[PDB]
Design a protein around this ligand. Structure first.
Ligand SMILES: NC(=O)c1ccc[n+]([C@@H]2O[C@H](COP(=O)([O-])OP(=O)(O)OC[C@H]3O[C@@H](n4cnc5c(N)ncnc54)[C@H](OP(=O)(O)O)[C@@H]3O)[C@@H](O)[C@H]2O)c1
Ligand SMILES: NC(=O)c1ccc[n+]([C@@H]2O[C@H](COP(=O)([O-])OP(=O)(O)OC[C@H]3O[C@@H](n4cnc5c(N)ncnc54)[C@H](OP(=O)(O)O)[C@@H]3O)[C@@H](O)[C@H]2O)c1
Ligand SMILES: [Cl-]
Ligand SMILES: [Cl-]
Ligand SMILES: [Cl-]
Ligand SMILES: [Cl-]
Lengths: 324, 324
């Protein structure tokens, strides 16, 4: 049995993402399951991996993608939590999610509540688990604190707005377009700003006044970190979620406020931590505040475009997904 | 009724530090005490204040200095914890410590154990309180963790080495001279490096290997913060104690390690925190690990030289003090 899958044979630009229709369908064993993929999330980390310059360099060739949603097609003998026909989503796969079928370890697969479709299931894995770790673990947020989600219109950003809202925070978000701004306001933000405007930081400061902001969830630290330090309240923290370069800062900016700059990586989470996050996000999905938003959809054939556009495109309006 | 005191009539360089011998001796009231000063510590912050460019900007003229040691000369009505003849040291003064007699608020005055001399009492106030906050409060130190004291040969540096030693930490330190390196080794560092050497960071790297360093106490974050991030263990933290400029950093350096950059300022401490720290340090003095180290001594008349040399001199070998 054969399938369509994206294969990378060598590292490089989006052009290295090959569509092949002659890829063997994996056969799950032991604790593995096989998922018939309906959609797969596109995460910016997949672009870094593909470029060959990220800290993870998979063995070539490989199929990209960690975040699928679909239906269990087959199970290994010990993958007792799942059966054929189960609607599921993932935070990892073994064989790669950019494919008609994906092999995954049973502990990186979760049931998909009936009220979320497969497109939404594909938005969950990295974005919502990352946002939850950043807020609950890294920032140790408390109800009533203020948060700025700096890059709120994409996958992690909207997830952060929804979690922050559920956990009782005062929420500011930024977006680069009018439509992105609108979506951010529909998903938890009390107030939104345009990060392409010359004076938007002034507008944020006018808005928060002298007390400043308790938490900043930063998607683009190489552009924003110094400005972030000026916005922090006394004892405030900026969580470095995303970063794509270097930045000049004044370390004195942390001193009088005793503020913190704190890095996060979802990959660093323990198994116990993932189980905690999964339980939190399942509760969100069933109560109904966890409602993933899909901003763009690409057929598998247009994977090079998807990669290009997630890094260089016009502006996010939610999660970008591949449709199978 | 007359005393000798340093007086600053206008902000500027070391040349603004004048000597006067006709200053009226202050009269303590309410919770104030008067201290007959034997020695006063020189803290770098006094040079920033003197320049007129620090956030604290005193009314002119003033006498500099927060950290004195001597004997209680007189007490206000309500300063019940003190009596004439008590040996004491300070972490603040009201009238200025660069003087034969200094007025101080009773809550910023602490008993000096008989076995420490007044020269050593002058080294305690800002240095040891700051280092204890940095290690205990900011870093949340646990025994057996590793620490680099980056700038270990000065007042806060040696304080940090001794506190770290009392916690059984694995201790690395840096100094800029042969004599500086030896004093750091003498006060608890397992290994020392020369921060004037080209590629001394590589020597530290080779020495700590892949596991890295749990805690960095950073005296000069504008020079070292980026190199610090490369040295940190997973969950590692660099505490910004001193900083005199800007620095380019890569925020991705915090992400894979989930490391933190944390500002500290001693004068952010609550009353309750100061009491906690005082209790810790009193125990340190009693049990014998808190043994202040005097690197250089200046008569009051050479205060201008002392300010010049603390910023621009040949290298620290402990606390710099003024002798009355
Ligand atoms: N630490 C981790 O474990 C972890 C996990 C997941 C993701 N990440 C990283 O976090 C970042 C966000 O991931 P994602 O999935 O949300 O990506 P995404 O869906 O592509 O969203 C990118 C976000 O960046 C925003 N942005 C553009 N210019 C900005 C600026 N000047 N200031 C602030 N934000 C700006 C975009 O806003 P507009 O489109 O509206 O302009 C959009 O909201 C990526 O760099 C990713 O690699 C890290
Ligand atoms: N955050 C706060 O509340 C607080 C409190 C007290 C002090 N401080 C600040 O902390 C800093 C240290 O205070 P201190 O009283 O210990 O000053 P100090 O007694 O003058 O000591 C200065 C130290 O900095 C070192 N140094 C010189 N070049 C260095 C380099 N390239 N990298 C790392 N260290 C280097 C010196 O080493 P060598 O002489 O051997 O070259 C010496 O150990 C000052 O900037 C001060 O303003 C902050
Ligand atoms: Cl990938
Ligand atoms: Cl986002
Ligand atoms: Cl005082
Ligand atoms: Cl020092």
């Amino acid at each position: 049995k054969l399938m369509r899958a994206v294969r990378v044979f060598e590292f490089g630009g989006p052009e290295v993402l090959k569509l092949r229709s002659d890829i063997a369908v994996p056969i799950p064993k032991d604790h593995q399951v096989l998922i018939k993929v309906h959609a797969c999330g596109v995460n910016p980390v997949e672009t870094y991996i593909r470029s060959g310059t990220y800290s993870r360099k998979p063995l070539l060739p490989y199929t990209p993608g960690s975040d699928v949603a679909g239906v269990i097609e087959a199970v290994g003998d010990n993958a007792s939590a799942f059966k054929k026909g189960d609607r599921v989503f993932t935070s990892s796969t073994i064989s790669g999610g950019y494919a008609e079928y994906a092999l995954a370890a049973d502990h990186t697969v979760y049931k998909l509540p009936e009220k979320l479709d497969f497109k939404q299931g594909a938005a969950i894995g990295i974005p919502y688990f990352t946002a939850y770790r950043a807020l609950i673990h890294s920032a140790c947020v408390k109800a009533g604190e203020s948060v700025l989600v700096h890059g709120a219109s994409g996958g992690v950003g909207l997830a952060a707005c929804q979690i922050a809202r559920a956990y009782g925070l005062k929420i500011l978000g930024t977006a680069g377009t009018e439509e992105g701004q609108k979506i951010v306001l529909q998903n938890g933000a009390h107030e939104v700003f345009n990060h392409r405007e010359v004076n938007y930081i002034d507008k944020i400061k006018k808005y928060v006044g002298e007390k400043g902001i308790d938490i900043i969830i930063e998607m683009l630290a190489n552009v924003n970190l110094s400005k972030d330090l000026s916005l922090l309240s006394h004892g405030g923290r900026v969580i470095v979620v995303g970063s794509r370069g270097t930045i000049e800062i004044n370390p004195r900016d942390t001193m009088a406020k005793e503020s913190s700059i704190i890095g996060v990586t979802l990959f660093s989470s323990t198994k116990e931590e993932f189980q905690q996050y999964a339980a939190a996000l399942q509760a969100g999905m069933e109560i109904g505040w966890l409602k993933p938003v899909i901003g763009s959809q690409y057929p598998l054939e247009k994977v090079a475009e998807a990669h290009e556009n997630i890094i260089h495109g016009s502006g996010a309006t939610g999660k970008m997904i591949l449709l199978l």
